[PDB]
Ligand SMILES: CCCCCCCC/C=C/CCCCCCCC(=O)O[C@@H](COC(=O)CCCCCCCCCCCCCCC)COP(=O)([O-])OCC[N+](C)(C)C
């Protein structure tokens with residue numbers, strides 16, 4: 215938590231240990247109180263609004279990316295989609311045929327005083 | 335509505351629209367269903383069925399809510415529909431009652447965390463402490479096996495769970511699954527000034 | 537009729553009632569019992585299905601490597617040319633040679649390279665990886681979705697080594713045997729081999745019945761209607777021939 | 781309720797769960813290696829079995 | 832298993848027969864005889880029942 219204004223991090227390695235790895239992450243921050251366009255991280259910090267929901271958890275706990283994701287709704291409509299939505303509609307392709315044919319049978323063929331064969 | 339998934343509720347109502355219509359098709363197709371309701375000297379063009387499209391569709395719902403009806407499946411062709419649609423109902427209601435008797439007892443079988451010994455088990459709920467206060471110094475030199483095991487979490491996984499300040503420690507509880515450990519008076523100040531919080535344990 | 541009396545049986549078994557209307561005192565005693573036969577069966581079906589959905593007590597496959605010798609559907613495993621693989625290929629017990637009889641003839645996939653690579657085969661397939669018995673007790677308590685089935689096949693033993701001829705062979709043997717009986721050598725085991733929170737399991741609410749749980753009914757429902765049409769054309773042939 | 785309580789009841793199963801069962805009494809041979817093990821044990825479950 | 836003891840062929844205090852039986856015992860574990868000897872005597876006379 216470098217107090218001053220710039221930082222000059224150093225890597226030292228040689229013929230003995232050339233294969234070495236590290237990956238940094240810096241963040242500018244100001245002490246409280248905290249004005250607008252500054253997500254006030256509770257870590258004695260104030261970071262820029264550009265760091266909000268970008269994907270780096272700067273004020274070490276994920277405070278900016280925590281409580282941040284776009285989601286959806288409508289659990290009845292979360293399956294009207296690929297294959298599972300088709301097998302609803304495949305059987306809906308069955309049931310609707312069983313409905314319209316059941317319209318024609320009742321209208322064309324009555325119940326009262328008729329012969330003992332019809333139907334389709 | 336919860337004990338059955340919302341695709342089952344659509345598949346049941348699609349079946350009730352289905353099986354009622356298929357029973358309607360067979361009812362004006364079957365020859366051993368055309369009967370004579372004639373009290374007098376029979377056989378003068380008074381041979382009918384009972385099943386309209388309205389009647390066959392109030393045999394579907396009438397056998398789904400388990401009340402029965404009057405529509406009276408008489409032909410062997412139609413009773414097989416009645417012999418299955420009844421068995422379709424008797425599994426759905428006996429899986430609705432069985433599953434709703436699982437939601438109401440699992441919420442009774444659970445106990446809320448009320449004692450830090452039971453917080454020693456809950457790895458899904460993370461601990462907390464103020465940074466190097468009296469509380470943190472208590473656990474790292476404790477001797478009771480449950481308390482050292484509570485330190486065994488916070489030592490190995492420090493990094494996030496050992497927060498800096500008490501005012502900062504409240505917001506971790508307020509915005510996550512956190513189990514912050516402060517002085518017992520400051521809890522009794524915070525709890526009655528912020529009514530959505532509590533003190534579990536002793 | 538015989539048809540009417542047999543649609544009083546099913547009509548009172550699915551609890552819908554019927555029209556057949558038992559009128560004689562002789563017949564109502566049959567109706568007075570067959571109704572009571574139904575009301576216990578359905579109330580023991582609903583009661584027991586409300587016991588499966590609130591307390592899941594899942595069973596298991598293979599529980600002893602002798603029963604894993606039968607399961608050709610579940611493939612074996614070993615680290616590549618470790619102590620484990622060398623044990624089976626010179627074993628003598630007929631079950632263990634038969635376990636080698638799988639892995640020799642079908643090598644090619646089931647004899648994986650590394651122990652860390654061997655865990656992922658179990659984690660992502662139907663695999664039966666065979667490692668040292670301590671490393672199981674380390675892996676199982678650090679990855680709570682895994683288990684140890686079976687017991688102990690071989691009996692090895694670790695040991696503080698020494699040069700060939702040394703006083704430090706014997707005077708550590710005095711020292712090791714004290715730590716077993718003092719209880720430290722067991723207490724040291726529960727410091728390091730104890731896992732970080734594996735009791736994460738309990739009776740969870742089922743959250744639904746899905747098509748995976750109850751989907752056989754729609755198969756029974758669809759098969760009943762297709763059977764009915766074959767019955768529906770049956771009277772159509774039967775009545776017309778008797779009409780003619 | 782009868783059919784879910786008996787499913788919720790588990791057998792005796794690992795001496796830690798025998799530490800709870802006061803209804804099922806313990807045992808040991810008289811002053812053998814087994815009895816001498818518990819009275820100088822240190823693990824809290826085993827001392828409670830000696831208790 | 833609660834404790835871990837171990838049986839063992841004894842010897843007088845300082846003897847060559849400590850070491851040269853240790854060579855011999857360790858061969859019988861890996862040859863498989865020492866397990867096969869266990870299934871000669873500890874195998875019971877017909878319990879199976881398939882549980
Ligand atoms: C893939 C499967 C497809 C198979 C195709 C399925 C086809 C099944 C078809 C089924 C329709 C016919 C069977 C029931 C009879 C209906 C009753 C009625 O209407 O009056 C009947 C009276 O008959 C009587 O007098 C006796 C009645 C009591 C016993 C009924 C038979 C028991 C068969 C138990 C099981 C039955 C079969 C069960 C099938 C599982 C009419 O009698 P009749 O014929 O008019 O008399 C002829 C007289 N004549 C020559 C002078 C004119």
Ligand SMILES: CCCCCCCC/C=C\CCCCCCCC(=O)O[C@@H](COC(=O)CCCCCCCCCCCCCCC)COP(=O)([O-])OCC[N+](C)(C)C
Pocket residue numbers: 289290335339340341343344346347426427430
């Ligand atoms: C025992 C046997 C009985 C069988 C009878 C079966 C039918 C019974 C007849 C009538 C009862 C009601 C029918 C609803 C059935 C499915 C809806 C559903 O799954 O619930 C979903 C929505 O459900 C609702 O909240 C209300 C319905 C939403 C309105 C839009 C769909 C209705 C339109 C036409 C529908 C048919 C379309 C197809 C036909 C044209 C889930 O509820 P929720 O929103 O998540 O609740 C919010 C609160 N919570 C988040 C904290 C939990």
Ligand SMILES: CCCCCCCC/C=C\CCCCCCCC(=O)O[C@@H](COC(=O)CCCCCCCCCCCCCCC)COP(=O)([O-])OCC[N+](C)(C)C
Pocket residue numbers: 565568569
């Ligand atoms: C008009 C008639 C009304 C009468 C009412 C009676 C109500 C009840 C009255 C009294 C309660 C009975 C208490 C007695 C104890 C039972 C003894 C027993 O063990 O089971 C007995 C079985 O048979 C029985 O269960 C007897 C009772 C039922 C009789 C038949 C049903 C009544 C029909 C009418 C009711 C429905 C219609 C409604 C009526 C409006 C004998 O068992 P077992 O064979 O010795 O077992 C040993 C065999 N083994 C060795 C192989 C294992």
Ligand SMILES: CCCCCCCC/C=C\CCCCCCCC(=O)O[C@@H](COC(=O)CCCCCCCCCCCCCCC)COP(=O)([O-])OCC[N+](C)(C)C
Pocket residue numbers: 301305308345348349352747748751754755758759760761762763
């Ligand atoms: C008039 C009839 C026309 C149709 C209208 C029906 C009316 C109602 C219409 C719609 C109601 C809802 C649809 C019903 C099925 C639900 C969809 C589903 O996924 O379930 C099943 C699919 O089912 C099949 O794929 C079976 C193959 C075709 C059905 C054959 C029926 C009997 C055939 C003739 C009978 C011959 C007679 C007797 C002689 C022997 C699930 O199958 P799964 O592969 O296990 O799923 C994998 C997922 N899992 C592993 C995680 C579980």
Ligand SMILES: CCCCCCCC/C=C\CCCCCCCC(=O)O[C@@H](COC(=O)CCCCCCCCCCCCCCC)COP(=O)([O-])OCC[N+](C)(C)C
Pocket residue numbers: 413414417418542546755756759760763
């Ligand atoms: C007149 C009629 C009298 C006969 C009664 C005898 C009843 C005895 C009933 C079943 C026999 C039980 C013996 C064991 C065999 C079960 C195995 C089986 O076949 O399951 C089959 C399904 O289920 C069926 O298709 C069978 C039922 C047919 C429709 C029900 C009508 C019953 C007759 C009328 C009853 C009405 C009321 C009663 C009054 C009459 C297997 O399905 P699958 O094809 O493998 O699906 C593959 C898809 N999968 C891969 C995703 C899984």
Ligand SMILES: *[C@@H]1O[C@H](CO)[C@@H](O[C@@H]2O[C@H](CO)[C@@H](O)[C@H](O)[C@H]2NC(C)=O)[C@H](O)[C@H]1NC(C)=O
Pocket residue numbers: 659660661
């Ligand atoms: C429940 O357990 C089964 C059995 O292990 C899991 O099925 C395997 O899952 C892995 C990971 O997705 C796959 O690589 C395997 O191919 C699956 N095997 C089979 C036979 O399906 C299943 O994923 C587990 N359930 C969940 C929600 O993870």
Ligand SMILES: *[C@@H]1O[C@H](CO)[C@@H](O)[C@H](O)[C@H]1NC(C)=O
Pocket residue numbers: 251262263264265
């Ligand atoms: C950094 O700060 C500016 C002003 O506070 C703000 O618009 C933004 O979050 C950052 N800048 C850019 C160019 O994204």
Ligand SMILES: *[C@@H]1O[C@H](CO)[C@@H](O)[C@H](O)[C@H]1NC(C)=O
Pocket residue numbers: 508528529530
């Ligand atoms: C407690 O609950 C929410 C935080 O989850 C907060 O918005 C609400 O205002 C609080 N209620 C009070 C302070 O009475």
Ligand SMILES: *[C@@H]1O[C@H](CO)[C@@H](O)[C@H](O)[C@H]1NC(C)=O
Pocket residue numbers: 679680681
């Ligand atoms: C255990 O396995 C399941 C796969 O069903 C997975 O969801 C879970 O995350 C695994 N646990 C760990 C710690 O990897």
